[PDB]
Structure formats: C-alpha cells, structure tokens
Amino acid sequence: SNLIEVFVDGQSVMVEPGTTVLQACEKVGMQIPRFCYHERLSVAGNCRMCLVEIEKAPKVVAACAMPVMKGWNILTNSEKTKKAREGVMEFLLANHPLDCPICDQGGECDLQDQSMMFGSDRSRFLEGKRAVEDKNIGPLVKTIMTRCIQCTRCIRFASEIAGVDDLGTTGRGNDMQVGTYIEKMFMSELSGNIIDICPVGALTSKPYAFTARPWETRKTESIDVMDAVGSNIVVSTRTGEVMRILPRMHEDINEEWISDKTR
Amino acid sequence: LLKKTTGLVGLAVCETPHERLKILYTKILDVLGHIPKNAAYRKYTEQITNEKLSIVKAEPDVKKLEEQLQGGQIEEVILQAENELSLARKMIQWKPWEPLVEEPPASQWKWPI
Amino acid sequence: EMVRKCDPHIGLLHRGTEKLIEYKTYLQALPYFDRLDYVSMMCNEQAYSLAVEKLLNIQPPPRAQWIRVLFGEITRLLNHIMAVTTHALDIGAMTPFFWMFEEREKMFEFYERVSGARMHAAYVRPGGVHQDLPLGLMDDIYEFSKNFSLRIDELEEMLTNNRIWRNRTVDIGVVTAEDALNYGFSGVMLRGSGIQWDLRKTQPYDVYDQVEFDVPIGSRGDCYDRYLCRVEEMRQSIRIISQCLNKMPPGEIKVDDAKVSPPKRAEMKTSMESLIHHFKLYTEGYQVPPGATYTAIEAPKGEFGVYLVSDGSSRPYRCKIKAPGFAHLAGLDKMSKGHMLADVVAIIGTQDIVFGEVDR
Amino acid sequence: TQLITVDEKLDITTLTGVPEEHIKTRKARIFVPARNNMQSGVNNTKKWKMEFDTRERWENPLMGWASTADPLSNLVLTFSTKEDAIAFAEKNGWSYDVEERKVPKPKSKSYGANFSWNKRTRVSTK
Amino acid sequence: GVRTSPTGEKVTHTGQVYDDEDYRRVRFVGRQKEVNENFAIDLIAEQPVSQVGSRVISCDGGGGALGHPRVYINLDKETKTGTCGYCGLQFRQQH
Amino acid sequence: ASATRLIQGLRNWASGRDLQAKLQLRYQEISKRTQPPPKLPVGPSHRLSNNYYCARDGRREAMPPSIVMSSQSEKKAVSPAPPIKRWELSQDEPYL
Amino acid sequence: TYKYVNLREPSMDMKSVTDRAAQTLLWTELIRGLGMTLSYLFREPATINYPFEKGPLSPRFRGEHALRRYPSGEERCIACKLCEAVCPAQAITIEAEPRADGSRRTTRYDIDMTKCIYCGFCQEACPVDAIVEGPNFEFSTETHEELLYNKEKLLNNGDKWEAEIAANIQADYLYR
Amino acid sequence: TRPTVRPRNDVAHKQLSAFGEYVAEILPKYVQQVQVSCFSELEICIHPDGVIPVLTFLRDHSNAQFKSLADLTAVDIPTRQNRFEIVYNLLSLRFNSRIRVKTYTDELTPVESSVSVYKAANWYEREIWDMFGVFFANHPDLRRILTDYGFEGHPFRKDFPLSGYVELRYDDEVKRVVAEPVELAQEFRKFDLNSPWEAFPAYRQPPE
Amino acid sequence: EDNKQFFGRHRWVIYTTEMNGKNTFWDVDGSMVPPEWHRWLHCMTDDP
Amino acid sequence: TSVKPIFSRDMNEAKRRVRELYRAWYREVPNTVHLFQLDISVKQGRDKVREMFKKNAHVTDPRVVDLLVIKGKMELEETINVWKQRTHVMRFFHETEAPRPKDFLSKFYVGHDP
Numbered sequence A: 001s002n003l004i005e006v007f008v009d010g011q012s013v014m015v016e017p018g019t020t021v022l023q024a025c026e027k028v029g030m031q032i033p034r035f036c037y038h039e040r041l042s043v044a045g046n047c048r049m050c051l052v053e054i055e056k057a058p059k060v061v062a063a064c065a066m067p068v069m070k071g072w073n074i075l076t077n078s079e080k081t082k083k084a085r086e087g088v089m090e091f092l093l094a095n096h097p098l099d100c101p102i103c104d105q106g107g108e109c110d111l112q113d114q115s116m117m118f119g120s121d122r123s124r125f126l127e128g129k130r131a132v133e134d135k136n137i138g139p140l141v142k143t144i145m146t147r148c149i150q151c152t153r154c155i156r157f158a159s160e161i162a163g164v165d166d167l168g169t170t171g172r173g174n175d176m177q178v179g180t181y182i183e184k185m186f187m188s189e190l191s192g193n194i195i196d197i198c199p200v201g202a203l204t205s206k207p208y209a210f211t212a213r214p215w216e217t218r219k220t221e222s223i224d225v226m227d228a229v230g231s232n233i234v235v236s237t238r239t240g241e242v243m244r245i246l247p248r249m250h251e252d253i254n255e256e257w258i259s260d261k262t263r
Numbered sequence B: 001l002l003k004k005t006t007g008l009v010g011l012a013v014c015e016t017p018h019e020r021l022k023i024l025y026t027k028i029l030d031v032l033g034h035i036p037k038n039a040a041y042r043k044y045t046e047q048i049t050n051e052k053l054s055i056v057k058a059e060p061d062v063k064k065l066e067e068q069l070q071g072g073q074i075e076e077v078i079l080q081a082e083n084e085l086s087l088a089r090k091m092i093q094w095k096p097w098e099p100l101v102e103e104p105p106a107s108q109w110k111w112p113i
Numbered sequence C: 001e002m003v004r005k006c007d008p009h010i011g012l013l014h015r016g017t018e019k020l021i022e023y024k025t026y027l028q029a030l031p032y033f034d035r036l037d038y039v040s041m042m043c044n045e046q047a048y049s050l051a052v053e054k055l056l057n058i059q060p061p062p063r064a065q066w067i068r069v070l071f072g073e074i075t076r077l078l079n080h081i082m083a084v085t086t087h088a089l090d091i092g093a094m095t096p097f098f099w100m101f102e103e104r105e106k107m108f109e110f111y112e113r114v115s116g117a118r119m120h121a122a123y124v125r126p127g128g129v130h131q132d133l134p135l136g137l138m139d140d141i142y143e144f145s146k147n148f149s150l151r152i153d154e155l156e157e158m159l160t161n162n163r164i165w166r167n168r169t170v171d172i173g174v175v176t177a178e179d180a181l182n183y184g185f186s187g188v189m190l191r192g193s194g195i196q197w198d199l200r201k202t203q204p205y206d207v208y209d210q211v212e213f214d215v216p217i218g219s220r221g222d223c224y225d226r227y228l229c230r231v232e233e234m235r236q237s238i239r240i241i242s243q244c245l246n247k248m249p250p251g252e253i254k255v256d257d258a259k260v261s262p263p264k265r266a267e268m269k270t271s272m273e274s275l276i277h278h279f280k281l282y283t284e285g286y287q288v289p290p291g292a293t294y295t296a297i298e299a300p301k302g303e304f305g306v307y308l309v310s311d312g313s314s315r316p317y318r319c320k321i322k323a324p325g326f327a328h329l330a331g332l333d334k335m336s337k338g339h340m341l342a343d344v345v346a347i348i349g350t351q352d353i354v355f356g357e358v359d360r
Numbered sequence D: 001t002q003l004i005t006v007d008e009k010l011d012i013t014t015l016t017g018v019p020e021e022h023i024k025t026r027k028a029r030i031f032v033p034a035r036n037n038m039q040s041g042v043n044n045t046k047k048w049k050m051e052f053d054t055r056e057r058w059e060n061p062l063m064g065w066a067s068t069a070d071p072l073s074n075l076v077l078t079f080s081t082k083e084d085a086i087a088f089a090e091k092n093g094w095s096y097d098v099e100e101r102k103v104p105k106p107k108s109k110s111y112g113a114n115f116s117w118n119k120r121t122r123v124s125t126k
Numbered sequence E: 001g002v003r004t005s006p007t008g009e010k011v012t013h014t015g016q017v018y019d020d021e022d023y024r025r026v027r028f029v030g031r032q033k034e035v036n037e038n039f040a041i042d043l044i045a046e047q048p049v050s051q052v053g054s055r056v057i058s059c060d061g062g063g064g065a066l067g068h069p070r071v072y073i074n075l076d077k078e079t080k081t082g083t084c085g086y087c088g089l090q091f092r093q094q095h
Numbered sequence F: 001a002s003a004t005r006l007i008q009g010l011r012n013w014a015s016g017r018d019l020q021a022k023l024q025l026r027y028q029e030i031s032k033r034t035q036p037p038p039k040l041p042v043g044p045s046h047r048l049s050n051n052y053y054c055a056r057d058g059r060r061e062a063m064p065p066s067i068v069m070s071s072q073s074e075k076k077a078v079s080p081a082p083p084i085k086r087w088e089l090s091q092d093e094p095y096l
Numbered sequence G: 001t002y003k004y005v006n007l008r009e010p011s012m013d014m015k016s017v018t019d020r021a022a023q024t025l026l027w028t029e030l031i032r033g034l035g036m037t038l039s040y041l042f043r044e045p046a047t048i049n050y051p052f053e054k055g056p057l058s059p060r061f062r063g064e065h066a067l068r069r070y071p072s073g074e075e076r077c078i079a080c081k082l083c084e085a086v087c088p089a090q091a092i093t094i095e096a097e098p099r100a101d102g103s104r105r106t107t108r109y110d111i112d113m114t115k116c117i118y119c120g121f122c123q124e125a126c127p128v129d130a131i132v133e134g135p136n137f138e139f140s141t142e143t144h145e146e147l148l149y150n151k152e153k154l155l156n157n158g159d160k161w162e163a164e165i166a167a168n169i170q171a172d173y174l175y176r
Numbered sequence H: 001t002r003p004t005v006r007p008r009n010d011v012a013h014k015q016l017s018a019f020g021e022y023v024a025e026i027l028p029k030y031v032q033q034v035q036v037s038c039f040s041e042l043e044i045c046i047h048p049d050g051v052i053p054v055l056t057f058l059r060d061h062s063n064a065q066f067k068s069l070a071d072l073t074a075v076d077i078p079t080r081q082n083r084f085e086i087v088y089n090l091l092s093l094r095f096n097s098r099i100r101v102k103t104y105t106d107e108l109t110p111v112e113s114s115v116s117v118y119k120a121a122n123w124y125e126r127e128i129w130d131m132f133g134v135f136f137a138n139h140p141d142l143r144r145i146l147t148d149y150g151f152e153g154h155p156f157r158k159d160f161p162l163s164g165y166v167e168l169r170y171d172d173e174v175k176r177v178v179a180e181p182v183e184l185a186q187e188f189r190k191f192d193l194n195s196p197w198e199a200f201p202a203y204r205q206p207p208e
Numbered sequence I: 001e002d003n004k005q006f007f008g009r010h011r012w013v014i015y016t017t018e019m020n021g022k023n024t025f026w027d028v029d030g031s032m033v034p035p036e037w038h039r040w041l042h043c044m045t046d047d048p
Numbered sequence J: 001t002s003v004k005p006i007f008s009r010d011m012n013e014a015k016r017r018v019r020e021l022y023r024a025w026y027r028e029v030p031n032t033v034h035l036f037q038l039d040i041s042v043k044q045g046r047d048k049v050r051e052m053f054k055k056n057a058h059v060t061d062p063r064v065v066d067l068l069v070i071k072g073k074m075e076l077e078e079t080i081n082v083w084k085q086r087t088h089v090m091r092f093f094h095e096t097e098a099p100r101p102k103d104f105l106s107k108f109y110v111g112h113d114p
C-alpha cells in the first residue's frame, strides 16, 4: 500500500494520499470545529474555523481543504490554533443577531456549541450589526437570513445533491446575501435537508417552527414508510406527541438525508 | 514537671514516658525482625523506629522530646507506638510484601468510561 | 432507669437527594444542599461550591470569598443558636429559645436582603455568589454584630452558671478522644473531647487563613463542654464577622469566566457571546472535567463533605454527601450507655442532629 | 480453597426488586445513538446506550400534562462497549435487541475536484 | 378582546375552549374560569408603526437592560413593516 | 427606647448590664430601605486587548490524574505531608 | 489559636470556698437567672401586629410567580423554554406555537406551585424578564389544584402586581 | 492564568506522589493503581481482598495515622463487570492530609466489613447495603438504614428508576396506608443536555 | 407611620370595613393591601 | 469462573439455609397475625410465605440464594422486632389493587401493555 505517516498532536497515524488534515484528525478521534465543511458536500473552505497549526510552518492551514503532507505534526490544541479559533468565532459572532431565545436552532446550534467550546466568552464588537432581508423560499423552509454565517452549504446542497442550481450568493463583501435574487420558491423533493445542514438558525423548519426545543425531545429511532426506500429516521417526541422527523445517517440507504414527504 | 492533664479525654498521663517509649520501640524492632528483609514495610518501619528511638535515647527532657518527636503530647506518641506494634503483629499474619494477588480487569479503573 | 441499648431508626426523612442530583445539572444540584442541613444553608452551599470549583480548576474572586466567609459565620451563628436553644428547650429551659430567635430572625432578614429567600438562598454558587451585596447591608450586619455579644452574654447568664443546667450536662455524654476519632466524629464532637482540630485552621478554605479567630477546646468531652464550645464559637463567629466587615475588598462577585458563571443581564442583552453563554449555562450548564473530589469544610455541625464525581458531562455522575450528624447519630449508641432516658435527650441535644443531612 | 465454582448463568433478577411485569415484558434496546443531524458534532455517538420500549403517555385530566405509568421510561443507561451492555442485559433478565454501530465511511475529498477539466464535479459557483 | 363560546364559556387568548359534550366543564360548575382579558395580540396591534429614517433600526424594547436583547431589524421591504421578534413593535422606513 | 427611666434603671439593674447602649430592637440607626442605585465593578477579564480566552482557560488546564503506580535503596520513609505544627494557646483570651 | 473552655481550677482558700457555699445555699445564680428573666419582663416585646403590621422584606424577595408584559400590552414571554430547562423541580411546563400574527408565543405556561422551590432560577434565566417571582407571599389556598397555575393565572398575577414588580426590578436590576 | 484559574499546589502534589509510592511499595500484595489528581488528592486503588490490611495500615502506621474515616461511598458504574466502586475517604489529623482508598465488587461478591478498623463504617457500609446491594461480610447488624421497611430493590443503583416502582397513599377501605404501582400525573421529563462537541481534549479517550 | 416605634412597628394599615363587596369590619385580611402600598408597608421602599 | 462465596459452598448448604429460613417464617406467622392484629388468618399468611418462597424457587446460583436468605432474615428481623407496622406486613397482600388482565383479549381491551 501507499499509506503516508502523519502526526496528530505527536501521535502517529497512517493515511491515504489525498486525505485532508481534518480527516487525518478524525482518524485519531479528534473532531476539528467546522461550519462550512460537510463530508457529503464539496469543500468550500470559506469559514476558516478549521484553521489548525502544522508545526514548523508559520501559518495556519484550512484543515478541511489542505491535503496532508508526509511528516506533518498537526497541532490541534496549540496556542495559535486556539487563537485562530477564538478570532474566527469572534468574527462569526460579530454581526450575528441576539436571537438565541427566539431562534428554533437554540440548543441544537453548532454556532452556540462551538462558541462555547472554542470561542471567547465575551464581545469586543462595540458597533451596530447588519440586518438582512428575510427571503421566502417556500412553505417549508423558514428563512431568517440575519442569522446566516454565509457558509454556502445551501448552495452546495442545491447544486450537488438536490441538483437545483437556484441558491447562491448575491452581493459582495459584508453585504453578500445567500438567496435566489428573485421571489423564487425552492421546492425540490429534498428541499428540507437545508434545514438539517444549516449550522445556524437561518434555515428552520416552518411546521416545526416555535413548537418545541431540542433538549426536551425524546429521540426515537424509526423507519420511513412514505416510500419503499426505507429511510432511517429520528422521530423526536415531546410528552407523547410527535414534534418533527429528522434523518438517521445510514451509508447504504439515505446517506443522511430524507425527502420532504418523510420530513 | 508532672503534667497534670494530657488535654485529651480518656488519655491518662504517662509517668515514665522515656522508658515506655524505649520498651515499645525495642519491642517493635523485636517483632519487626520476623519480617523478611526485602519487605519495604520492615525497612521503612525500622528506619522510623530507629530515628524515634535515637531521639528518645538522646533527649533527657520530656517537653523538648515532645517538640522534636513532633507527634503532639508524649502519651499519644506512646499510643502511636502501641498502634505500630499491633500493626506489625498484624502485618506478619497478612504477609503483604507478596506480589499482587489478582490483576484488575482492563477497564476497572478507567474514568470516564 | 438505665439505658442498655439505643437503636436509632432513621430514613424517616430520606428523600433520595443524591439520586435526584444525578439527573440534574450542577446549578440545578445547588439548591439540594440548602435543604440538607436546613439551619446551615450557605455552609452547604459553600461546600458544594468548593467541590465544583475544585473540579472546574477555577477560583472565586476575592470579594466573593469574603462574602462566603461572612455569610458562613452568620450561618454559624444561626446553627449554634438553633443547637443551643433547642438543646435547652428539650431539657426544659424554654425562654432563651424565644430570646435568641429574634436575633435569628434578623439574620434571616440578612439572607432575605442578600438573596430574596430567608432560608434556602441558592446564593453561594460555583464561581462566586449569585448577586452582589445590596447597599446598606454591611452597616446593618455591623449593627447586628455590635449588639449580639450581649445576647450571647445573657444566654450564657441563663444557662452556664445555672446548677440545674450543669446537673443535666456535666456527667453526661462523655466521649474519649480515641473513640471520637474512631467513630468519625467531627467539629464540636471532637473539640469537646480535647482534640485540637478545626478544618478552617488546618485545611483552610476561601479566606480563612486571612482571618484571626480562636478555637475552643473542651476538657471533659461531655455535653457541657460541647455547650461551651458552641457558645465560644458564637463569640469567635462575631470576631470573624467583624474582621470580614473591616476587610471586605471591592470587585466582582462571580468568576469572570462566562463559560462557568453567567454574565450580567446588562451585557447578556447586548453582547452575542454573552447571550450564547447565558443560554447554554441556563439550559445545558457548564461541563465539569472528569475526576472525583472529596471537598470537606468545617460546617457548624462538623465536617460537611461532598464526594462529587463527574464524567465530563454537565451533570454529576455521583454526588455523595458526607454529613456530621450521620456519624454523630451513629455514635449515639455508645454515648448513651450507663445513662438514663432523660440523659438521652440531652445527648441528642449535644450532637446537633438535623435529620435532613442524616437521611438525604 | 476459599473459592467456589459456579457454572451457572449469571442472573440477578430476584435480587433487584424489579417486578415481573417490568422484567419479562420490556424490550431493552442496545444501540449507539444516532447523530443529531442539526449538528455536526459526534461526541454523542461515542458510547452505547440501553433504553426501553416506550409505554403509554396519556393526558392528565386536570392540567393536560403527560401522565405515565412506566417507571423505566426515563431509564437510559450508558455503556462503553456493546458486550458490556449485552452482559448487563443478560444479567438482569431483560429481553434486548442490538443495533450495530453505524460509522460513516471515509470520503474522498478533493478541493481540486471542484475545478476539474473534463469531469461533472465542477462547481457552478463557490 | 375575549369572546364567548355557544356554551357560554369564554375563550382564552390561545383559542382554548371546552366542547359542549366535554365533561371537564364541571370543574367550573359553581366556580369561575379565570381567563385574562388583556389579549397581547389585540394590544400590540394598537401600537403605531414607527417611521424611522434609517435602513436598519435597533430595538431593545425600552428600558435598556429592562427590555429584551437588542436586535437589529432590516427595513428594506417596502411592502411589509419590520417587526421585532421579541416585543412585537414594528417599524417602517419612511422613504 | 420609649421606656421610662424608672423601668429603664430597674431593667438595667436586674440584667446587670446597660441595655440601652445595646438595644435588640432596631430604630433609625439602620440603613435606608430605599438606596441610591449602585455601579458595580467588572472583573479583570473585561479588557479589549491581551484577553484571549485560551490564556485564562481554567477548565482546560485540568489534567487527568497522574498515574503514580499501576499494575500495567536506603531511601527516606515519607509521610503525606510534614507533621502538623502544635497550635499556640490564645494570646487574646486563653481562659488561664 | 485555641482556648480552653472549662479549664479553671477553683480557689480552695476559705474565701472562695465560702463564696461557693453561699452560692449553693443562698442560690445566687438562680437569683441571677430570675433577674435576667425579670429584665426581659420590662422590655418592649418584638411582636408586630400582623395582619395590620408586616414583616420587613427586601426588593429581591421571591414569592408568587407572575408573567410580565412590555409597556405596550404585549406579553414578554417568547417561548424560549429556558425557565423550564433550568427549573430544578421541573415545575414549569411550556407548550408553544406561532400565534395568529406569526409571533413566537406560548399556549401553555404551567407552573406547579406545589413543586416550585421558589429559588428564582426562572427569573434569572429569563432573557426578557417575562417570568418573575413577585412580592406576594399571602396566597395560601384551600385546595391543592388551586396552586397549579396556568398561563391565565400567571398573566393575571402579572397584571395584578405589575405596579410593584416593576418597581422592585427597577430597584434591583443593577445588581443583576 | 492568575485571577480566574485555581492556583496549583505542586508541593502537595509531589508529597502525595511520594506517599503514594510509599504505600504502593509497602503493600504490593493489594495495591493496584495509585494516582494523584491535578487538584492534589491521592487515590489508592486496591484489590478487595485487602480492605482490612490497607485500612489497618493507614490507621496504625506512624507515617500515615489516618485515624478518621470521613466518608464511605459506593459508585455504581454498570459498564464494568465489577460495577460497584467502594470508596474510603480517610483523614490523617497528624499529617493534615486526606487519602482515598477505592476498591470494587459486583452484586454477589462480598466485601469484608471494616468495623474492626473504623467503627464509623458501621452505618456507612450499612447504607451501602441499603442503597446498592453490596453485602458486607462480618458486619454486626447489617440491614437497611434509609429506605422503607418493606422496600424491594436498591435505589442508588443506576438501573433503578428515579421514581420507584411503588408509591403510597392512604386507602379508606382497608383503613391503611397502601403500596400501589407508581403512576406519575406528570412524567419526569428527561432532558438530553449533552453537547455533541468535545469539551476537554485532555480527557480524550483513544478510539477503537 | 410612627418612626419612634421600632423597625417593624413603625408602619401599619388600618384596613377598611368594606372591600369588593365583603364586610371586612372583623374579617381583615393580609392580602387586602393593593400593590402600590405593598412595597411601602413591607418596607421594600421608604417612599409611599 | 471461581467466585468467592457468601455463606454457602454448594447448593446443598444453600438449601439448608432456605429450609431453616422457611422454618423460622412458619414459626413466626402466628405471632405476626397476633401482635400486628391482622385481619388475615394464620393459614393465609403461611400460604403467602409459601408463595414468596416459591416465587424465587428457580435460582441455581448459590450466591443469589445466599442473598435471598439474607434478605429474608432481614424481613424476618423487621417482623419479629416491631419495626414494620401493620401496613408493611399487609403490603405482601395486594388488596387495594384491581386484578390485572391475564389473557390476550382483556389486555387488548384495556390498553397497550403486552
């Protein structure tokens, strides 16, 4: 075989050539924080949350896109890696709105969780925030674009898995706005998985909207019956009542998606 | 000086502390000579008992003996000497210098699980 | 007349506290400690706070530590008023109960001014205290402590020199020091038998190495020397409270790690990181690193310890609560031998037993 | 001697004080819990779980609360390996089914694949 | 504005009212059904829409730290007023 | 405080103390029920610079317990700590 | 750093022996105790005239729960379920849905006051000051289910006690 | 790391490490692990055949003198075949230190009672019996201490539910407080609070 | 008010004889105090 | 597979202990009906003791039946000494409980439980 030897925090691990730094750290059991990266989409590299230090290299590398080189010692808990994560989380939470109580994603938010795990605990942003016009992309996906962190998982999903090519970023700079540019209704058969792979509350479920909250829900692992695919699902219930239906990851049926009928 | 009370309730004043400590330390050494010499308990207890016995033999005064034995009142030093003697008589019967009786299971002391 | 065997049956107030702790977060587990020794509320708060802060590898700010020692000695005055007055009330002296509970009413007013509840404050928290002292409170603590010595004096006038009180307590409940150490006794149950031990001196916590107080040591190990130790501990608690009022530093009252202690409500409504931290602390809670501690303090009944086990999550894995009254009520069977049934109530008096902390 | 040889199956059902109803009619479920697809974190998919089949939750006539009669509804146990959970379930007489750990397969990620010459994996925007 | 069912029972601001055949009205027999008569949906609709000369307005509800977390509202839709998600106060850009 | 001097002197005689200097009833010496509004200070981490959380992270400097001995000369015997120093009798009021 | 309670040796001279014998026979400390009790007979008692006189309370007091409103009529609760997440007794039950104008509001807001431990974690967890714990402590009922408050009862407590809860929060909020 | 980080005590850490080596080499027959935490507490993880030798050593030896049994505890960890973890918290007043002695058993193997060493243990291991089901051999009066008299099961086991299996009420027919199977008018709402992101990299376990 | 009385006695209410229909001549009640006087009477404030 | 015993080396010593415990309960039941002044007969309490013994009669592990004899001696000690009340003695007789549906059809009629 052709497995090259890389080091993650000093520990040796053998990886295939073409393996990214994030997957090399995954093979030793360490999950690098990420917002734009998703292992079933393509690689964007445009949130800079996976910025990890390679030692003897005076610049942090984006671990989601950088292929490993032979002999790299990946420093996942070093000083400049933690400073990179805290600074990038500071810029992510600079213009982000204080909607955590009135947001459906609270308690199931990646931005909250790895702000708690990897960010700082207080703000230096002494300015006014942006506010983005909310879009109407259908009766299923509630859209509050002020909460968007522009990770472009919308666009990669609709371009690569949904196969729609109707989501995208309009504008430039801090005024860059993910949308359709027109009052267009994003109705694919898989239009509800952008609710899943939105890491923030910019895309929530409109039927599930405001009704529950993820920590009080009891997770039942069940099967779809709406088609003969047999999509493995999570039926989350709260006090004996079905709140929503989330997918289960199964590599041979429904990779981590479900259809809009199932959802 | 005939210390009137020990301060500790139920702890009587020992009238002859030096002779009592000498008898107890030589008795600890006489019991402790029944333990194999490779045992760490025998070596450490012979060491501390010879240190305390050298202090007791090299000090005529009682109160200075209390301040340099560093164990409080002299009667609780005598109490600890009796406790060490009874301990050595138990440690002969237990034989704890032997190798480990059983290895634990592989995740027995692993925390968190 | 004699007592041959005394078998206390307990568990009549067993509520399963330290199983309910296992299904609740650390902030949610804090108000269970107010209800264990319900005359020693902020002392048990401080013990659980110190256990969680030892596991979190953080420390309170200095002003929060001085507030913890101030209200711990106010709590010590509360508990020793309860102990002395109910121990005199069960024997038959019913009047200094009513005399000292007005001062105890004023200390519950101190708790209500500092927290909003008179008994179960939920105030001393891991990371500091919940809320700063309101303005004008320390002046009223001074006005309390300036007069409370005369209250202890007239209590001691009623009971200590009294021949009827000395007949009920002097030959009664004598404990040897070796059996006091061997039975897990702590606090006044050791200090009455002449054992020079106090956990505020030997294993000092928050700022007790910076205060100056004496430790009363009994000489006969009976009910009467433990009464005198509790009276003199009220005296020394007045001494510590005067030193805490004089040496109170300025500053913050929570730890400034907002991943542990929640941010201020002015900046929760302004900052984004502070709103996320307020959210995740009051829903999930702070994660505690794995590992177990045994953190014990000098409660007014003795050694109150918490054996707290974390598994890395935001909820405790096991939270064992060591209480003094459990070992003291275990030693009740030895301590009442050779005495009469009327001496048994005095021995249950001198071992200050609150059955919440005995039973959990 | 001082050790006895018990060649029987380890069964402690008569010691735990659980009634016969909640031993012989409950289906324990030994499983690694699925990742919440709301999030990308995988720390909740590390350890094995043992939960039981959900029994009836009904409406309280007074307040509309969810009443229950199942004691074992909130009983979620945590295990390190599958065999420890299976040994614990066989020890207590619980009928169980075991799901396997579903790990994600390794993916082939290439940032240069987004800008290919003759392949369909070109992005239309970035 | 509280209304009344055909059974005579008042409807709350949720919309909850018991049926005629629902037996659980016997808890109000000889007693009363405590409803609140200040409906928040009828009272936030009484507030006027604030005409502001900015593109993005901020709202804390008033009182500073006595209100809600300060959020920033976009006002680029000229069809729809920009409603605050906490307090319900809504804003229109005057141009 | 409204007691007349005859009852006041009788009460001070029967107690043996001066009870008017230390009244257990509270009067206008106490603080106001309405106070001016405070201005509470902030902690040391309220800084706009040199304030990265990784340099003040308490929970992440907790290590797993160091395994001293595990089952996979003439050295001095040790104690868990040096022996306790004997307490000094009180210079303030020893009761001696 | 320690003192000996009860380590006094009594003087065995004839003066102190006669003192102790006069104390035994003529009952000196018993008259001392009677004198201290007679001294309290002539004090003004600490008794307040309840119900007409009330005990002192601070503006931090934790009594009856209430749901507050903004100064426009709009209720403050936006259904975020922090107060039942932090509730150490799980006394709070909340269901929610978007109401007719799309606002995130509650339909159920129950507080079992017989589960409630009155510790005020709900009022300190509430980001919008909706749930508070007011000054009212005189709300004893005659029936158990009268202490099981729904949203209408708590909104009526808020509308009842708003003129006081607002001033308590005004007096105290800078400590929070 | 000055204001908000707990100050580390390396002197006590070194002293407890040296005394852990001391105890581990005096008693190699029973000592299995010795570990000192980062907040400077000493653990002696032993074999359950050496409850009485190790505790009697720590009680009587002149370099230990752990005269006070502070707390005695069991910890239920069901993923172990020896699921219980009997914890002995000890205090030395002479050397002003605390040691922790930890052992293990399952439901059926008895632990030797340490009432011959510490008479404080008489109620603590009786409580361990009442709460966990750990039997203690050669105990003077081993029975329940905290639960009800006709109670079935051991409550602090983690396979035991939060509410019991039975609950009480007065029944006016039989004129007697009766035990009936438990029905909660409101179910205890289990909250899933654990975050899916790793909090502490120092405690990261190596994977399979 | 009588501020010469001690703290607790210095504020009181003489209740009405009729409130909301009920004859409260003898049936005085602690919850008859409206919320604007409940701060002043319980000494939550110095200001009526 | 070599485990440490509790009191019994094999199953026959365990049967000896079960047998002596049954003897002790059989001797105790008339005194229990007398001094707790129960409304049951002596025969009914003895049949309940026989029922509670035959409930656990399928155990072939010596340690489990050792712990069963230990817990039975604890219940007997709580019964001889008046530590239980009349309620704790009568909790063996589930009198205020309705009889559960036994066949499939009545369990189908009343609810969802198997």
Ligand code: SF4
Pocket: A096, A097, A098, A099, A100, A101, A103, A104, A105, A106, A107, A109, A110, A111, A112, A147, A199, A200, A201, A202, C276
């Ligand atoms: S997306 Fe996340 S961080 Fe943003 S408001 Fe919602 S819960 Fe808060």
Ligand code: SF4
Pocket: A147, A148, A149, A150, A151, A152, A153, A154, A155, A178, A197, A198, A199, A200, A202, A203
């Ligand atoms: S709406 Fe969500 S998924 Fe889409 S780009 Fe923004 S953060 Fe990413």
Ligand code: SF4
Pocket: G083, G086, G087, G088, G089, G090, G091, G092, G111, G115, G116, G117, G118, G119, G120, G121, G122, G123, G133
């Ligand atoms: S005061 Fe405490 S117990 Fe009561 S509802 Fe609020 S959080 Fe729950």
Ligand code: SF4
Pocket: A101, G076, G077, G078, G079, G080, G081, G082, G083, G084, G094, G122, G125, G126, G127, G128, G129, G130, G131
């Ligand atoms: S915390 Fe406040 S806003 Fe959130 S659900 Fe509770 S009362 Fe409503």
Ligand code: FES
Pocket: A033, A034, A035, A036, A037, A044, A045, A046, A047, A048, A049, A050, A051, A062, A063, A064, A065
């Ligand atoms: S995860 Fe690599 S940059 Fe977004």
Ligand SMILES: [K+]
Pocket: A105, A194, A195, A196, A197, A198, A199, A200, A201, A202, A203, A204
């Ligand atoms: K989302």
Ligand SMILES: [Zn+2]
Pocket: E059, E060, E061, E068, E084, E085, E086, E087, E088, E089
């Ligand atoms: Zn607003």
